[PDB]
């Protein structure tokens, strides 16, 4: 049963990236102001915060097995900090343009970064953060990168060039390119995490969300309802729902069977930019970042 409860919301400068820690009740936010914050959303106290740079930090993830966060900013740099001490672990120029998205491999010491420089790059932290591969082919800003959780030797990139490309580590060309028909670009791409469907989902400035079968490359459904740019759309890892957020200021919860909207929320923080779901579905927690702060919600 739905029953959405606000577990914790706080105001801040624009939140561009957001992520849950898998074992600690923490959420990381990365802000347009160059600040990043880690909050305990149950006690409502900051565990750690850092003024990383003066430029926007659009991407941030926990690397829990190393006790790190990894962040990427408009100053072209990837930085890694230990969240127990605040100490900076590494600081390098990753791309000659904005970093939009960072993905962390579940079992290997690999991170992917997607950039306005039209590429995705693969970095190996057990090889001194060496650049091990650059994936070329996209023709506009790479807005989102995500590993296939069912096979993380592959990953998807979503791009303003209106395509999603799916790649294999160690190979220079896409396994396939998905022509989305979302003519104003792809802002976000996500995988359905369960084994029963080979699904991906894309979000666009053209106000649509689309579901794809990655075996046949077919569009399964198109979700309409948002009134401004759709910033993200994701499958919930345990509940039969899709969650999206938009510059129209709303989050929408969609039935993942019928593809109909179940609930629209305006949490009152203006434009929505980013989303996270708790890795193990603890308390069905989700979190989203907005122009004016973030909110952590329990869905039921």
């Amino acid at each position: 049963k739905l029953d959405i409860k606000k577990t914790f919301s706080n105001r801040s400068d624009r939140v561009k990236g957001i992520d849950f820690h898998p074992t600690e009740p923490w959420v990381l936010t990365t802000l347009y102001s160059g600040r990043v914050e880690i909050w305990n959303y149950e006690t409502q106290v900051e565990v750690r915060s850092i003024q990383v740079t003066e430029t926007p930090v659009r991407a941030g993830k926990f690397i829990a097995r190393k006790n790190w966060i990894i962040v990427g900013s408009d100053d072209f740099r990837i930085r890694v900090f230990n969240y127990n001490t605040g100490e900076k672990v590494v600081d390098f120029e990753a791309h000659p343009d904005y970093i939009r998205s960072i993905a962390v491999h579940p079992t290997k010491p690999y991170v992917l970064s997607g950039s306005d420089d039209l590429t995705v790059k693969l970095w190996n932290w057990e090889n001194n953060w060496a650049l091990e591969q650059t994936f070329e082919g996209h023709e506009h800003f790479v807005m989102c990168v995500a590993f296939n959780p069912k096979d993380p030797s592959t990953f998807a990139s979503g791009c303003l060039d209106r395509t999603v490309k799916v790649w294999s580590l160690g190979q220079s060309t896409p396994n396939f390119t998905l022509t989305t028909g979302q003519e104003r670009g792809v802002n976000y791409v996500d995988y359905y995490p369960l084994p029963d469907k080979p699904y991906m989902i894309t979000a666009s400035d053209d106000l649509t969300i689309k579901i794809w079968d990655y075996q046949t490359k077919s569009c399964v459904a198109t979700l309409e309802g948002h009134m401004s740019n759709v910033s993200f759309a994701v499958f919930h890892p345990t509940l039969p729902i899709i969650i999206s957020g938009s510059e129209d200021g709303t989050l929408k919860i969609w039935n993942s069977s019928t593809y109909k909207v179940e609930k629209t929320l305006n949490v009152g923080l203006e434009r929505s930019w980013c989303i996270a779901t708790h890795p193990t579905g603890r308390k069905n927690y989700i979190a989203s970042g907005f122009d004016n702060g973030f909110t952590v919600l329990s869905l039921g």
Binding site: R14, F141, L160, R271
Partner: peptide, 5 residues
């Protein structure tokens, strides 16, 4: 630049 915000 697109998506500057």
């Amino acid at each position: 630049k697109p998506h500057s915000d």
